Amino acid sequence: NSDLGTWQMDCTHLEGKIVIVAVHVASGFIEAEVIPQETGRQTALFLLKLAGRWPITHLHTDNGANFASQEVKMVAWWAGIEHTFGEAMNHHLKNQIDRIREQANSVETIVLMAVHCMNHKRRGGIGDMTPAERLINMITTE
Amino acid sequence: NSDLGTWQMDCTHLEGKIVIVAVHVASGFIEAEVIPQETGRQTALFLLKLAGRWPITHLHTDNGANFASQEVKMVAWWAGIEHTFGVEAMNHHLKNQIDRIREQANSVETIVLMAVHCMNHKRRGGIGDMTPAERLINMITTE
Amino acid sequence: NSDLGTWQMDCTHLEGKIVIVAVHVASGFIEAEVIPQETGRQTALFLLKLAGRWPITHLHTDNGANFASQEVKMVAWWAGIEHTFGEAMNHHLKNQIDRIREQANSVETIVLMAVHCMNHKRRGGIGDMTPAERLINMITTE
Amino acid sequence: NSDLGTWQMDCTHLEGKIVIVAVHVASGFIEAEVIPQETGRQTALFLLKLAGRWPITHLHTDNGANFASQEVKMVAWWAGIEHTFGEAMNHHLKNQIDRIREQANSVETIVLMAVHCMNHKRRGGIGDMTPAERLINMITTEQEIQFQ
Amino acid sequence: KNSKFKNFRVYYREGRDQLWKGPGELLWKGEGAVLLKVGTDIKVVPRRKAKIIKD
DSSP: OOOSSBOEEEEEEETTEEEEEEEETTTTEEEEEEOSSOOHHHHHHHHHHHHTTSOOOBOOOOSSTTTTOHHHHHHHTTTTOOOOOOOOOHHHHHHHHHTTTTSOSSHHHHHHHHHHHHSSOOOOSSOSSOHHHHHHHHHHHO | OOSSSOOEEEEEEOSSSEEEEEEBGGGTBOOEEEOSSOSHHHHHHHHHHHHTTSOOOOOOOOSSSSSSOHHHHHHHHHHTOOOOOOOOOHHHHHHHHHHHHGGGOSOHHHHHHHHHHHHHTOOOOSSSOOOHHHHHHHHHTOO | OOOTTEEEEEEEEETTEEEEEEEETTTTEEEEEOOSSSOHHHHHHHHHHHHTTSOOOEEEEOTTTTTOOHHHHHHHHHHTOOOBOOOHHHHHHHHHHHHHTTTSSSHHHHHHHHHHHHTTOOOOSSSSOOHHHHHHHHHHTO | OOOTTEEEEEEEEETTEEEEEEEOTTSOOEEEEEOSSOSHHHHHHHHHHHHTTSOOOEEEOOOOSSTTSSHHHHHHHHHTOEEEOOOOTTTHHHHHHHTTTTSSSOHHHHHHHHHHHHHSOOOSSSSOOOHHHHHHHHHHHHHTTOOO | OOSOOOOEEEOOOOSSOSOOOOOEEEOOOSSSSOEEEETTEEEEOOGGGOOEEEO
């Protein structure tokens, strides 16, 4: 069981381009964008932006330039965000991209639409509330 | 009419770079980043990247990259933004925080981030203990 | 985002009567009255009336006989003010009159009626803060 | 009495002039000026000027042809100040002026000059608020209660 | 927020004289009064005869 602080992320490719995704395990919030290179810099940069916005108190990833990354340590320290060695939500990401593929050209605009949709598409699982409405709630509940 | 979702955008130049800021008016919650060309497509992806997370109702700005930009036109039509009647100093405060903390990290891109964290998650109040990140959720999650 | 005690004194007429005005620059709060004539006395005397209640350190102002009154200077030092970098507010108080413009017969009363309403027109650049509710919060944190 | 919205309007004479006065019962915030005539028009026009800036709600007066006019009726209601008909921080008004009387000629200018000195002069310690600074500490404290 | 401040000092000023009545602890919960704990003794007071201050 997670909590309102724990998050996870990974970087899959998307039609040539590389994409770093990060989802708040507690609800089903997906935050993602595209990064020009799978470096240690770009990863830590996606963390810095994340932490200044949401209440992240426990990150989680696999391993390599994303994980260990001196930048990702120098950034996790600055924001008190820990790390765990080491989810399958990018399979949804892609599944939602083709499903909406013709709306805009670039991948740099497709993955943005995909999230806007996975954050704002209600369902059940004890909740009418959209994936966004869950997070904005867990944050207030606390 | 709105009093929960009107956000305000504008752009600055910092250490010979362009910084885009989006401040939720009735809550002073910041969101800033360094966009390469100060062109209609970067303003659009920003606006969008933003709109797909917080229930942004309305928006406001000057003209040029923000509004003539049909790229923004489409991306504001798609999600449902809007711009009408209503000074921006958040840049001044954002630049300040950066100033005070410029030493911390080399990259301007990385420092506008640090400063954005340091403003949001930093409770100065105004008849309320809470940081703007908490001021936001308070309203945004009030109904 | 301006400074705690930096005011700005306007001077306009309406319906025929002179209306001195004083806007707390950073909270937009306003102060106004229907002074008899544009004499130095009336401006100095009004400037003496802000200082009695609010912290006034600086003062943007027209370079007419506004500051060009021997008397205002005489009062500038007595309290501790200056002169610096100086028509929304007047034109706001003016639009505010035109709407409540029936309640009271006169200007002497309506320009004051107006100011009551303007100090409690809830729109706030951050938080519900009205112009009045704005300076008081400004001052306390001092 | 010390209801945070309570203000009292005494009316006087000084040097042949007429000095209207208003005290914030819970602190010491004196507000005063010279009114060319002792009349409701003036007393309404003053209460209004007072109503338009302080979180006032109770005006305690002492029932005289002045503060019982229709002019002060309209204003009071219009701003929502329930009136209740019936010298200290109005006595030292005449006093503290004498220790100013020379600084400027007119009673007008002199009574205003008086409220300045009067409003910014601290009291003792361990709660060392001047009149003015304390008023804001009292108003703001109400708000600091919040609606959590 | 669940954790109220308590940096408030409230001296219950009634009217029998102008003798400041030792700043009690505020903990009011209502409207027509002012419940205030002094040491251990909790004292509800009619709004009109109370005075709260901060810091």
